[PDB]
Swiss-Prot record, chain A:
Pfam families according to UniProt: Ribosomal_S20p
Cross-referenced SUPFAM superfamilies: Ribosomal protein S20
Biological-process GO terms, alphabetical: translation
Protein name per the record: Small ribosomal subunit protein bS20
Region (Disordered): 1-25
Gene it is expressed from: rpsT
Organism: Thermus thermophilus (strain ATCC 27634 / DSM 579 / HB8)
UniProtKB/Swiss-Prot annotation, chain B:
Subunit details: Part of the 30S ribosomal subunit. Contacts proteins S8 and S17. Interacts with IF1 in the 30S initiation complex.
Family note: Belongs to the universal ribosomal protein uS12 family.
3-methylthioaspartic acid: residues bearing it: D25
Name of the protein in question: Small ribosomal subunit protein uS12
Region (Disordered): 42-62
Lineage summary: Bacteria, Thermotogati, Deinococcota, Deinococci, Thermales
Role this protein plays: With S4 and S5 plays an important role in translational accuracy. Interacts with and stabilizes bases of the 16S rRNA that are involved in tRNA selection in the A site and with the mRNA backbone. Located at the interface of the 30S and 50S subunits, it traverses the body of the 30S subunit contacting proteins on the other side and probably holding the rRNA structure together. The combined cluster of proteins S8, S12 and S17 appears to hold together the shoulder and platform of the 30S subunit.
Post-translational modification: The methythiolated Asp-25 contacts a modifed residue of the 16S rRNA close to the decoding center, and might be important for decoding center assembly.
Basic residues bias (residue ranges): 45-56
UniProtKB/Swiss-Prot annotation, chain D:
Keyword check for Ribosomal protein: yes
Any Pfam family the entry gives: Ribosomal_S17
Family, per entry: Belongs to the universal ribosomal protein uS17 family.
Gene label: rpsQ
The protein, known as: Small ribosomal subunit protein uS17
From Swiss-Prot, chain E:
Quaternary assembly: Part of the 30S ribosomal subunit.
GO molecular function: structural constituent of ribosome
Signal sequence region: none
HAMAP family tied to this protein: Ribosomal_bS16 (MF_00385)
PANTHER family per the UniProt record, alphabetical: 30S RIBOSOMAL PROTEIN S16, SMALL RIBOSOMAL SUBUNIT PROTEIN BS16M
Name assigned to this protein: Small ribosomal subunit protein bS16
Highest classification ranks of the organism: Bacteria, Thermotogati, Deinococcota, Deinococci, Thermales
Gene Ontology, cellular component aspect: cytoplasm; small ribosomal subunit
InterPro entries: Ribosomal_bS16 (IPR000307), Ribosomal_bS16_dom_sf (IPR023803)
NCBIfam families recorded: S16
Keyword Electron transport in annotation: no
RNA sequence: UGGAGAGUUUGAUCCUGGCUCAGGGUGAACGCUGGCGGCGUGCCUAAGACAUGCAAGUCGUGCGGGCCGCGGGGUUUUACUCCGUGGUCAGCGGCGGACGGGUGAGUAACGCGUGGGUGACCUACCCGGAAGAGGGGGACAACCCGGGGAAACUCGGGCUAAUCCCCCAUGUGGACCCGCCCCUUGGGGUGUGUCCAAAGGGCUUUGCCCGCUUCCGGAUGGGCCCGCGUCCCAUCAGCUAGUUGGUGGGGUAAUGGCCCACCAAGGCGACGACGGGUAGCCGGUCUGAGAGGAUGGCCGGCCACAGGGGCACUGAGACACGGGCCCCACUCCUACGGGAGGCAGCAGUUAGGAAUCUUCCGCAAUGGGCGCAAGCCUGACGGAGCGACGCCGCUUGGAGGAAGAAGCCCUUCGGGGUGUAAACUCCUGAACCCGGGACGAAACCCCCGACGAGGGGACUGACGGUACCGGGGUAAUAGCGCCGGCCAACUCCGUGCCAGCAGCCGCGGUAAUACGGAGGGCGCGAGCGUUACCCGGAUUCACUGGGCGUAAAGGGCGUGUAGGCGGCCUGGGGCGUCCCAUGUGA
């Protein structure tokens, strides 16, 4: 009785979860780095931000996040984590930052 | 509404069609009735201005 | 369609012969000769002074009744004229005269424009080699109107074509009587025919 | 080109923001008489320098805020509380139009 | 992609296209960016085809894409005949 | 190159002033009448409710399977695979489904129109430019499996390929933080650190082609912002809590009070806020001498909506008419065991209405989607159909034909009229019959050349045997309005303030050019009238272009706020104003 390209929606369902799943990981990881960069642990912090950075762009290639959004994320991120580690912290690694 | 011409066929419950155009003589009336439409019929044995008066053309020969 | 029926009532009414029949409207008795008074029961009665409107009216009809066309086709030409250049009025006659069926009357292929029309309509007439059956054709300079082949003969043409030997056809006209063909040469200036009409009034009329 | 306008300040009462009053002269579409008009603008002063009277210029800019799309250009003629008063009495007189 | 194609004009049974540039998702009589000549597919006139052949290649340069029945009327205008 | 007026207040005059007609226009409708063709045009009302068909699909040159085939791999007893081969049904993946099509409800607003902005931004497919495709793992359908369901089917159980998914790697190149560099509102350059790429399928195979991934351009399409313009009621005069600004955040392709905190107390309005009423805006369109006034229907541009609402997903792109979830209203199916639908798409039905059509043909052409391409889909479109709804073109004949029959009208009974009208005589000949017969179609493809440039060669016409061409060939529908003045066209009879007419002034009271019929006449003609509405006339909202002593109109008189207006001279500025050039004005 109808168009069988309703798949186009059923297709969306996968693309929905798939790109949704990655997207939760992005933030829950992004979570970590922030808390850590606030408690001096600039070591384990920039291990995550380095992981954060990769998590984003890796989805950016695909159809999830795109454009200046990764940039907008990553910016305000290392625009912040570093601006936390100013609380002594000591740049345990430039392993994220062109310090 | 005004009923024009000579005689008609309108009792009470008779469907009609309203035209537009007062009478001037009769105050309050502002509308005419078109003839030969719905339950109001044309003027019988009228030969001249049959465009009004909803009167169809009569046969002249035989 | 066109006017059909009582014509000679119109050489009169307008009160001036307008040569609308064949030879009759040219023979001693053109609906006016015998009775040069308006038609109907009220014919031999003294006219009352016309209105200015009435005066303008009669003048227009006259002209139209001469060329014998619908009021439809007629006024388009007036506005067309009215829109054009300079005199944007008197030019009118030029547009009236460019009518195929009109020309054919002047070219003496026929005698009544009514007779002319039935030819064009029956397509006994050709233009530049083209079977042209449309009495409204605005012909122009150098266009050529000739009898078609299936009709070069025909009793009705010959005598109608023949009797033309006598008069100087219009300045804007030309005719190979033997060759059965004519040429629209030019646009007939107002000069080129003093019609019994005062076209000034037709203008005045149509600007109601 | 970005629009360029010239007007008087009537409000400094916003933080780092001001209100510029712009006039314009032109003839009336039908009656041709040459007439004036006014529009207020909320101008950006990210260093609240400009103040009451500062006859200044402003320039169309990216949306700083709602209602607020003009940055100040430059002072032209500071101290003009005389023009300001016109705006003030006019708004004052409004009270005596209170439909009572 | 943007395109070059046949935009119908004239009348019923009296075709009279207008050769033109627009978006492939515009209407076939919709708004265009630039007209480049006409085409009566009924050869009712000498001037029954015309191109501004410079512009034609210009849009073709930047990335226009004519139709399987628009190139034919541009191939027939030496747009492709590319010298030696 | 463009401008006219008339009727009606009086016994009469001049003036004011209103009512009224003559003009043009319409998506029309209604009455009488109705021949043809063409090109247009057709739910203006219920954005009310819809039966049925159709309107969006495509590729086996992504992948794996079903069956049919396909010949024949080949056989310890009806096949067997083996691809390929087709084609096949779907599933997997890929692109389009966001265009096209409809509608005008909502919307007084940056929606539109026009001119600009973005150092504040995205743009798939197309084009150009720079470099790469190094390798490693896996899931779900399909098939199978049982369960459940009436179906809609549905859950669960089990394998598997790719251009599906993941990872390692590579890095031209890109992104992010800090630096300086230039430039300047987050533009460009670079330094270091850290993150990012992938894909294969087909062969005239050993070479090419269709694709893959990063970057910069181009072009196209946009998002956001700004200035100016955009209806009626002040008998709506005051409005405002995200209200206004700030700071910092959240969010987006990106600005912003867009959202959220916190801080400040601002923001708006007689230049008309706020509220109410109506409306989609424009190019245009109608009228007008113009200035204006009126209008937004078909066509084109943009906005908005897809039963009423809300929401997000996928995606380059939507918050999506023919995609998804939810609520409501409504209608339908059902073994009732429960489920289903969204015409403002094309036709069509109903209801409402004064009123608006075929449930037609074809992708032949144009355009659009997919594909290398054949080819496929296309109610876009190209045609046909219905309606005098409009414009245009054409016919119902032409020449002759009487001092001018008959009949019918008047009549001062002498006559006059209809009237060359008919008859009648010649001529042509709409229709109809026969034959022929299109244009609209040249490319995609094919040959050679490199499938490029090139010549060249080939298929296809729904409309349709249609128009048009030839021959033959028949005198072949006319109606409607008006005839007191304005306003063109007059006489008998009937009627007797009755029956009736009327746009205004007014006609009818036993002699009516005003009623009704008749004869005759005027006016248009497959049309003629009417009604409704817009503009004109109306210089009667008067800017062009008017008035206020007695015709309607000076505030009862002051003082004065805003506002409007401003004397004589010389400078600077050049806002208005004026000129030129240029872009824009589709
Ligand atoms: Mg997305
Ligand atoms: Mg009457
Ligand atoms: Mg002139
Ligand atoms: Mg578009
Ligand atoms: Mg070709
Ligand atoms: Mg004029
Ligand atoms: Mg009086
Ligand atoms: Mg009197
Ligand atoms: Mg008056
Ligand atoms: Mg008057
Ligand atoms: Mg006029
Ligand atoms: Mg009228
Ligand atoms: Mg038609
Ligand atoms: Mg309806
Ligand atoms: Mg209802
Ligand atoms: Mg159904
Ligand atoms: Mg759409
Ligand atoms: Mg659309
Ligand atoms: Mg429709
Ligand atoms: Mg409002
Ligand atoms: Mg308002
Ligand atoms: Mg790899
Ligand atoms: Mg089961
Ligand atoms: Mg399983
Ligand atoms: Mg594998
Ligand atoms: Mg990697
Ligand atoms: Mg930079
Ligand atoms: Mg990839
Ligand atoms: Mg293969
Ligand atoms: Mg777009
Ligand atoms: Mg708050
Ligand atoms: Mg903030
Ligand atoms: Mg911010
Ligand atoms: Mg988005
Ligand atoms: Mg204002
Ligand atoms: Mg007001
Ligand atoms: Mg409202
Ligand atoms: Mg509305
Ligand atoms: Mg307009
Ligand atoms: Mg005009
Ligand atoms: Mg005009
Ligand atoms: Mg105007
Ligand atoms: Mg308007
Ligand atoms: Mg309308
Ligand atoms: Mg419409
Ligand atoms: Mg439109
Ligand atoms: Mg509905
Ligand atoms: Mg959709
Ligand atoms: Mg939706
Ligand atoms: Mg929408
Ligand atoms: Mg639908
Ligand atoms: Mg429909
Ligand atoms: Mg009904
Ligand atoms: Mg219908
Ligand atoms: Mg139609
Ligand atoms: Mg097609
Ligand atoms: Mg095509
Ligand atoms: Mg293709
Ligand atoms: Mg194929
Ligand atoms: Mg189909
Ligand atoms: Mg079809
Ligand atoms: Mg169509
Ligand atoms: Mg017709
Ligand atoms: Mg009718
Ligand atoms: Mg007689
Ligand atoms: Mg007689
Ligand atoms: Mg005769
Ligand atoms: Mg004969
Ligand atoms: Mg044939
Ligand atoms: Mg083809
Ligand atoms: Mg070729
Ligand atoms: Mg060839
Ligand atoms: Mg035939
Ligand atoms: Mg014949
Ligand atoms: Mg006959
Ligand atoms: Mg005869
Ligand atoms: Mg009349
Ligand atoms: Mg008249
Ligand atoms: Mg008269
Ligand atoms: Mg008598
Ligand atoms: Mg009597
Ligand atoms: Mg009498
Ligand atoms: Mg009397
Ligand atoms: Mg009368
Ligand atoms: Mg009478
Ligand atoms: Mg009569
Ligand atoms: Mg008569
Ligand atoms: Mg004035
Ligand atoms: Mg006056
Ligand atoms: Mg005065
Ligand atoms: Mg008085
Ligand atoms: Mg007075
Ligand atoms: Mg006084
Ligand atoms: Mg006073
Ligand atoms: Mg008082
Ligand atoms: Mg003052
Ligand atoms: Mg002054
Ligand atoms: Mg002065
Ligand atoms: Mg200009
Ligand atoms: Zn005569």
């Amino acid at each position: 009785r109808n168009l069988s390209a309703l798949k186009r929606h059923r297709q969306s369902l996968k693309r929905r979860l798939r790109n949704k799943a990655k997207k939760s990981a992005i933030k829950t990881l992004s979570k970590k780095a922030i808390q850590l960069a606030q408690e001096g642990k600039a070591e384990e912090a920039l291990k995550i931000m380095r992981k954060a950075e990769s998590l984003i762009d890796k989805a950016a290639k695909g159809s999830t996040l795109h454009k200046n959004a990764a940039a907008r994320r990553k910016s305000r991120l290392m625009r912040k984590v570093r601006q936390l580690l100013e609380a002594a912290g000591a740049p345990l690694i430039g392993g994220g930052l062109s310090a | 509404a005004y009923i024009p011409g000579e005689g008609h066929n309108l009792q009470e419950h008779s469907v009609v069609l309203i035209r537009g155009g007062r009478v001037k003589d009769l105050p309050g009336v502002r509308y005419h009735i078109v003839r030969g439409v719905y339950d109001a019929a044309g003027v019988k044995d009228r030969k001249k201005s049959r465009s009004k008066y909803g009167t169809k053309k009569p046969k002249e020969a035989a | 369609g066109r006017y059909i029926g009582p014509v000679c009532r119109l050489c009169r009414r307008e009160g001036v012969k307008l040569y609308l029949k064949g030879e009759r409207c040219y023979s001693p008795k053109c609906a006016m000769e015998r009775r040069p008074y308006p038609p109907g029961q009220h014919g031999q009665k003294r006219a009352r002074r016309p209105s200015d409107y009435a005066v303008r009216l009669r003048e227009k009809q006259k002209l139209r009744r001469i060329y014998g066309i619908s009021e439809r086709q007629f006024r388009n030409l007036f506005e067309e004229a009215s829109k054009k250049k300079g005199v944007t009025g008197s030019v009118f006659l030029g547009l009236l005269e460019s009518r195929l069926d009109n020309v054919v009357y002047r070219l003496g292929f026929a005698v009544s424009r009514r007779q002319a029309r039935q030819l064009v309509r029956h397509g006994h007439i050709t233009v530049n080699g083209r079977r042209v059956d449309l009495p409204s054709y605005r012909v122009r300079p150098g266009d050529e109107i000739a009898v078609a082949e299936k009709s070069r003969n025909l009793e009705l043409i010959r005598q109608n074509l023949e009797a033309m030997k006598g008069r100087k056809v219009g300045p804007w006209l030309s005719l190979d009587v033997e060759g059965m063909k004519g040429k629209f040469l030019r646009l007939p200036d107002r000069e080129d025919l003093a019609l019994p009409v005062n076209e000034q009034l037709v203008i005045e009329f149509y600007s109601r | 080109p970005k629009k360029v306008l010239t007007g008087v300040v009537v409000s400094d009462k916003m933080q780092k923001t001001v209100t510029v009053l712009v006039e314009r002269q032109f003839p009336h579409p039908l009656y041709g008489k040459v007439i004036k008009r006014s529009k207020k603008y909320l101008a950006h002063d990210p260093e609240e320098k400009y103040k009451l009277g500062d006859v200044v210029e402003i320039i169309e800019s990216r949306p700083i805020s709602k209602r607020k799309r003009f940055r100040v250009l430059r002072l032209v003629e500071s101290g003009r509380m005389d023009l300001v008063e016109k705006y003030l009495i006019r708004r004052q007189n409004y009270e005596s139009l209170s439909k009572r | 992609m943007v395109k070059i194609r046949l935009a119908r004009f004239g009348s019923k049974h009296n075709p009279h296209y207008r050769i033109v540039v627009t978006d492939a998702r515009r209407k076939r009589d919709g708004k265009y960016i630039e007209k480049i000549g006409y085409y009566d597919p009924r050869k009712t006139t000498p001037d029954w085809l015309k191109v501004d052949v410079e512009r034609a290649r210009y849009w073709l340069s930047v990335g226009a894409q004519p139709t399987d029945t628009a190139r034919r009327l541009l191939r027939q205008a030496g747009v492709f005949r590319q010298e030696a």
